Amino acid sequence: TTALVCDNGSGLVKAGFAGDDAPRAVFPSIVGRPRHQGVMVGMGQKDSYVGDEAQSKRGILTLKYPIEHGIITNWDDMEKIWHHTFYNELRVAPEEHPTLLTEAPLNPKANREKMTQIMFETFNVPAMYVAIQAVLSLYASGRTTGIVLDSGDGVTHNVPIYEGYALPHAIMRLDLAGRDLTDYLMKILTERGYSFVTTAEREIVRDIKEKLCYVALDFENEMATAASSSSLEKSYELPDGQVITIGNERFRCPETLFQPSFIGMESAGIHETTYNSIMKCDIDIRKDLYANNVLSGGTTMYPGIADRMQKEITALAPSTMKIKIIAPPERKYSVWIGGSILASLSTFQQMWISKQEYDEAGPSIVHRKCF
Amino acid sequence: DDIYKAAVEQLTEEQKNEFKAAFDIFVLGAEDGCISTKELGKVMRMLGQNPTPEELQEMIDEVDEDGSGTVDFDEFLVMMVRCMKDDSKGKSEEELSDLFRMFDKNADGYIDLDELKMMLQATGETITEDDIEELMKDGDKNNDGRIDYDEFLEFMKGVE
């Protein structure tokens, strides 16, 4: 039979059968209970709208993501999300399909063990396998080397790989991602008068960020230009009218990636954690990693980031090496495409964690040889 | 590919007139007289199926060799039947590889065209020397004078 390549993510759940080009169903991972009282009788009001249904009734819900930073903080809601994904968005019972979840690097063990225990006890799948979210993104590019920066919505991690041999001592995981950029944008919009507070209006700020923000090639020059002319002010129509005008908030929101001091984080930007991740590698594979830097994940879709990052790394790196940044147009679904490719391989067909194996060793089987 | 050309050659005027009437009904009001890549993709998205525009470009390059993005009658039927890709998996790989390896009766690593000639005499399909020459050209990519094993995979790739 065919395998189910699910990809929990944090912000958008992407799923679909193995062997295709794009995920079959992509929908936000939010579960929102209603918060008001409700007076109409017999309206058929449910107790929790999940997935894309709660992005249409969000006016009277309190949306809450079940995955904070890679890790899962609310297991009941995550179980509800998985149940919805299997039964309503794909309509395939899990009793007859292997599953291939994905997990960020350096995550707590208990999260992974609980994930496999749920998949084997509640949904009762035949066999499931958990894979690191960066190796898949490297599969999708058709490479076999390269250092991949997978800046998702929950957590940004940077896994270097050479000739198929991952370097476990050079993984640099940073917890700044799309959600913190949304919060920072929502916080700097208040400097013009627009106040978004409700958890429903966070979605509106996210839409503003997606449609308007861009990464500046040079920060100081853009700050000077936006403060003199008015060629940058782009307007946007809220879900009820009252258009708003975003000035130099456009390139200040995604600039937080390269200067995490804006949101008070100490660490260095995504332009310098990649160079540090390279320098921890051996001295003889640094040229190949320099030449095959891969971008993935949703947050790396800002217009103009593949040039800013290349300029920064070229500034840091030695002058002789060639710096090349691979930015495929299908960046958002790169991890899932790689997952489909991996699940479609014949050599991989014996790596699944078969159910009888789980019955013999318990949920701690995932840390064992079947990784 | 020419697989769909063979499939539509199997088909008759029934399919021709059926798809002609379907064009008359649905493409009614289009200023084209054919189906464009963009039109086909937009219509697919309207119905629900969402193939990639790269697939649109691939299909238009295949059926419409001139690159016009339209569909001539024969290539139109080829493109229309291309959507339903029922036959896949290309027969068997290793067993057919053994058959091709034993096809080299001389066992020199070289497949003489005369062995192919004898096998075709066994088949006896209506073919002239230019036809088998053209087929070998489709197969003998490197023009090494034989049927290369990798090229044997290539020409039988996807072939049922």
Partner: peptide
Amino acid sequence: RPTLRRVRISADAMMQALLGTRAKES
């Protein structure tokens, strides 16, 4: 590395979905 496509769903179903209600003979 081979590529598998399930996007190419049955073409008769595509014709039915496009023609909607008028999808009677095709």
